[PDB]
Amino acid sequence: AGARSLLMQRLFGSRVTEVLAAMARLDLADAIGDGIADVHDLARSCDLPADGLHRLLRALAGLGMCEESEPGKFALTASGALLRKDHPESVYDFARFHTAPETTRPWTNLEQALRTGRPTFDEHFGSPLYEYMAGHPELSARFAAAMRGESLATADTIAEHYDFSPYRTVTDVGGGDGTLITAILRRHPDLRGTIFETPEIAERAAERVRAAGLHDRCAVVSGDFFDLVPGGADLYLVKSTLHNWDDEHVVRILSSCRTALADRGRLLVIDVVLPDRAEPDPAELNPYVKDLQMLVLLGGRERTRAHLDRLCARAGLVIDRVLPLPPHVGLSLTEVVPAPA
Amino acid sequence: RAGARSLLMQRLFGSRVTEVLAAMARLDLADAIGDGIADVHDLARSCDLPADGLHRLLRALAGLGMCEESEPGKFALTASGALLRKDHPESVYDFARFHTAPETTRPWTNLEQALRTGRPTFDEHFGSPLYEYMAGHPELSARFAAAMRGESLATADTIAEHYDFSPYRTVTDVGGGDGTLITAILRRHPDLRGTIFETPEIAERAAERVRAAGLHDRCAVVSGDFFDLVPGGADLYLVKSTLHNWDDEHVVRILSSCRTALADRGRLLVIDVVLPDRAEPDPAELNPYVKDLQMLVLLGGRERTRAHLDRLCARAGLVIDRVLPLPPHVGLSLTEVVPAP
Numbered sequence: 316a317g318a319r320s321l322l323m324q325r326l327f328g329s330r331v332t333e334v335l336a337a338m339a340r341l342d343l344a345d346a347i348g349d350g351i352a353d354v355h356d357l358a359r360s361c362d363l364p365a366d367g368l369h370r371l372l373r374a375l376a377g378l379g380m381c382e383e384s385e386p387g388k389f390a391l392t393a394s395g396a397l398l399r400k401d402h403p404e405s406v407y408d409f410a411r412f413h414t415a416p417e418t419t420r421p422w423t424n425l426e427q428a429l430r431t432g433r434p435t436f437d438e439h440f441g442s443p444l445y446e447y448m449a450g451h452p453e454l455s456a457r458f459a460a461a462m463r464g465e466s467l468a469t470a471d472t473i474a475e476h477y478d479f480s481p482y483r484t485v486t487d488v489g490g491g492d493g494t495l496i497t498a499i500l501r502r503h504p505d506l507r508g509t510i511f512e513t514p515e516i517a518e519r520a521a522e523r524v525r526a527a528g529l530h531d532r533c534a535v536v537s538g539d540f541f542d543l544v545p546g547g548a549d550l551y552l553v554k555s556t557l558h559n560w561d562d563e564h565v566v567r568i569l570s571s572c573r574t575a576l577a578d579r580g581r582l583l584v585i586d587v588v589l590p591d592r593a594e595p596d597p598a599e600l601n602p603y604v605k606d607l608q609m610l611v612l613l614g615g616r617e618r619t620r621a622h623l624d625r626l627c628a629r630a631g632l633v634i635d636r637v638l639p640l641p642p643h644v645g646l647s648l649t650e651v652v653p654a655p656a
Numbered sequence: 657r658a659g660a661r662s663l664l665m666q667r668l669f670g671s672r673v674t675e676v677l678a679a680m681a682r683l684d685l686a687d688a689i690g691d692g693i694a695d696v697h698d699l700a701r702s703c704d705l706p707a708d709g710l711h712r713l714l715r716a717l718a719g720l721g722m723c724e725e726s727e728p729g730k731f732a733l734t735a736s737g738a739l740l741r742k743d744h745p746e747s748v749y750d751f752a753r754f755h756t757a758p759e760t761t762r763p764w765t766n767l768e769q770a771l772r773t774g775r776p777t778f779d780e781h782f783g784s785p786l787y788e789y790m791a792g793h794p795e796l797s798a799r800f801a802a803a804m805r806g807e808s809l810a811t812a813d814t815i816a817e818h819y820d821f822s823p824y825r826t827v828t829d830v831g832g833g834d835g836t837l838i839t840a841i842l843r844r845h846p847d848l849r850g851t852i853f854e855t856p857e858i859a860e861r862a863a864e865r866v867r868a869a870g871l872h873d874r875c876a877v878v879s880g881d882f883f884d885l886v887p888g889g890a891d892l893y894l895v896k897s898t899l900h901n902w903d904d905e906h907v908v909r910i911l912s913s914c915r916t917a918l919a920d921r922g923r924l925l926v927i928d929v930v931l932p933d934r935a936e937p938d939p940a941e942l943n944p945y946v947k948d949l950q951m952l953v954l955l956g957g958r959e960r961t962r963a964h965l966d967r968l969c970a971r972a973g974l975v976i977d978r979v980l981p982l983p984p985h986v987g988l989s990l991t992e993v994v995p996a997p
């Protein structure tokens with residue numbers, strides 16, 4: 316029963332996603348809100364007949380997103396609640412971004428990406444993903460809130476699983492809207508921070524730093540990590556960034572980080588560390604699905620320890636040590652330092 | 657908090673999981689790997705992919721439980737993966753290919769429009785109702801026949817242990833496909849005689865299966881239209897995964913044909929999803945609400961409650977005598993239907 320059931324689960328994933336994508340697109344979590352909503356009331360809220368919306372809501376209830384309390388009356392589960400825009404841990408923008416054509420249409424050509432080793436995004440939309448997003452403000456803002464949604468799991472745990480006490484300054488290279496650094500600064504009140512981001516993402520970081528009340532302890536600057544990373548910090552973070560890039564580009568980024576570490580600086584690579592032998596993984600987001608997403612969108616990849624250490628060696632760096640996060644997060648903390656010779 | 661988030665992440669990334677499985681099926685990787693351990697460099701030549709590209713796909717497949725990486729670059733199938741072999745007696749290869757084909761997936765890209773209109777999106781995308789289309793496309797017809805065999809194996813294996821066929825001399829399967837259900841029944845009950853009633857194109861697939869099974873001397877194949885009639889004279893009639901293909905008016909017509917054929921001493925066994933009044937999660941290998949939405953987008957059919965089916969029986973001069981369960985992993989029930997007083 317189990318062997319067949321698992322294959323049936325894998326094969327019918329795309330249809331499950333379309334049900335979830337409809338819930339997010341129709342903003343049904345917000346329409347339902349806290350309490351019990353009548354399907355006839357919800358139908359008028361998003362120009363659908365009652366019968367059709369009832370069948371979608373029955374499906375969402377079967378997939379664990381809603382509960383049918385009485386016939387035609389639905390409430391959100393804890394899972395459905397996370398699609399509310401107003402949820403403190405909202406994954407709404409995460410759901411919209413990963414069900415948007417910009418992240419899904421490149422997967423229709425997964426085969427061609429595997430054959431070429433190059434992303435399919437470019438041919439579908441006319442440019443590399445980051446140039447496209449720099450030119451599409453709505454999607455760039457969606458992207459920033461999506462990486463926030465994903466990073467909450469890591470942000471909530473990183474302080475318990477890494478010792479930040481020895482450091483006075485920390486720079487987050489590709490630090491997004493500052494979700495990671497603000498969590499770290501809130502738990503370490505003597506610590507000062509910098510976010511280094513693209514022009515477009517840095518404006519999101521500025522308003523997050525203000526809203527977090529960290530204006531006096533966290534600087535926000537824009538620049539290009541293919542140029543020089545600003546020097547003199549004791550700790551540099553780089554989270555969910557190296558996996559966006561091929562090996563030649565990762566060497567250039569690590570090279571820029573090496574100049575910035577100088578003598579005393581340490582680099583903390585926050586990313587999936589793939590095992591040498593691939594097996595099922597308890598992480599909330601599958602690391603091998605992450606690998607193939609990075610391929611189709613950006614021409615990046617997830618890496619083993621040995622693989623990343625090889626790229627470190629080309630940048631004049633070495634892996635000191637790899638620290639785990641709780642099994643559900645699926646990211647590790649790779650401590651990287653300059654190579655004596 | 658943790659569980660609620662994890663389940664939502666599982667639902668959102670189903671479409672990417674399905675693209676990895678679709679790639680495995682399309683590239684015939686299950687066959688290329690076979691019984692043993694296969695090296696990625698050998699498999700790379702068997703499907704015209706570079707080694708790195710294929711290795712990443714196989715590592716994703718290992719992550720999703722479809723195979724195992726015993727040594728770096730060396731892969732074996734799991735129980736789950738082995739069901740995608742064409743040589744497997746319980747193969748779901750054709751089922752996998754059918755449900756990842758444009759003909760079943762493109763209608764899901766307009767799920768919303770189907771919910772709004774209550775009409776299938778298939779017709780707009782391909783130019784005719786699904787059964788018309790398949791009558792005029794022999795390759796998709798043959799794939800469909802093999803697909804339903806794959807689905808029906810779970811019902812076929814269990815139906816004898818959960819229903820007493822001993823009281824009956826003759827059994828007619830109304831829309832019985834390639835004969836998978838009735839050949840399972842006849843193999844377990846040596847004194848039983850059977851008839852498969854199907855469209856002219858599918859009946860050729862059924863006659864092929866019946867001859868290959870050595871059952872020609874107690875299994876006949878008859879073709880026609882169950883809107884016109886069902887072949888009379890049989891003790892037990894079966895109609896499996898068929899009523900859910902049609903709207904209420906069409907179901908009533910099918911059930912009127914069955915009624916005529918039942919006469920006095922005939923009995924009908926409707927084998928289909930029985931939806932509860934309140935939608936909740938289900939341990940079935942195939943989600944019945946996703947079945948509901950597949951029926952909508954492909955055919956404008958639907959899954960139905962007991963009470964709904966009972967009033968459709970009433971309009972045909974039939975009543976539900978009782979409902980019998982199958983093991984929870986199957987997700988279908990056996991509804992006994994008899995002439996009304």
Ligand SMILES: Nc1ncnc2c1ncn2[C@@H]1O[C@H](CSCC[C@H](N)C(=O)O)[C@@H](O)[C@H]1O
Pocket residue numbers: 445462463466488489490491492494495511512513516538539540541553554555556559
């Ligand atoms: N050339 C470049 N210079 C600086 N930042 C860049 C860059 N190209 C991409 N980025 C940034 O790299 C980030 C990668 S996504 C990771 C964001 C954040 N660290 C998190 O884990 O949530 C994006 O925020 C993007 O804006």
Ligand SMILES: Nc1ncnc2c1ncn2[C@@H]1O[C@H](CSCC[C@H](N)C(=O)O)[C@@H](O)[C@H]1O
Pocket residue numbers: 787804805807808830831832833834836853854855858880881882883895896897898901
């Ligand atoms: N007008 C018609 N007359 C008879 N059979 C029909 C029909 N229209 C469709 N069918 C058949 O009804 C079946 C529905 S699919 C179910 C097939 C089989 N009972 C199984 O469970 O595996 C198809 O095989 C299709 O060919």
Ligand SMILES: CCCCCC(=O)Nc1c2sscc-2[nH]c1=O
Pocket residue numbers: 465555556559600601602604605608609612669
């Ligand atoms: C199961 C797959 C989950 C994938 C999550 C994902 O894609 N993260 C992501 C993206 S999308 S564009 C740039 C980035 N950087 C990232 O870290």
Ligand SMILES: CCCCCC(=O)Nc1c2sscc-2[nH]c1=O
Pocket residue numbers: 327786807897898901942943946947950951954
């Ligand atoms: C996750 C649910 C998928 C259900 C599979 C499905 O729809 N089977 C099916 C089809 S496809 S065309 C005609 C039919 N008749 C059926 O019983």
Ligand SMILES: [Cl-]
Pocket residue numbers: 530531
């Ligand atoms: Cl200030």
Ligand code: NA
Pocket residue numbers: 485486509544545546547548
């Ligand atoms: Na700095």
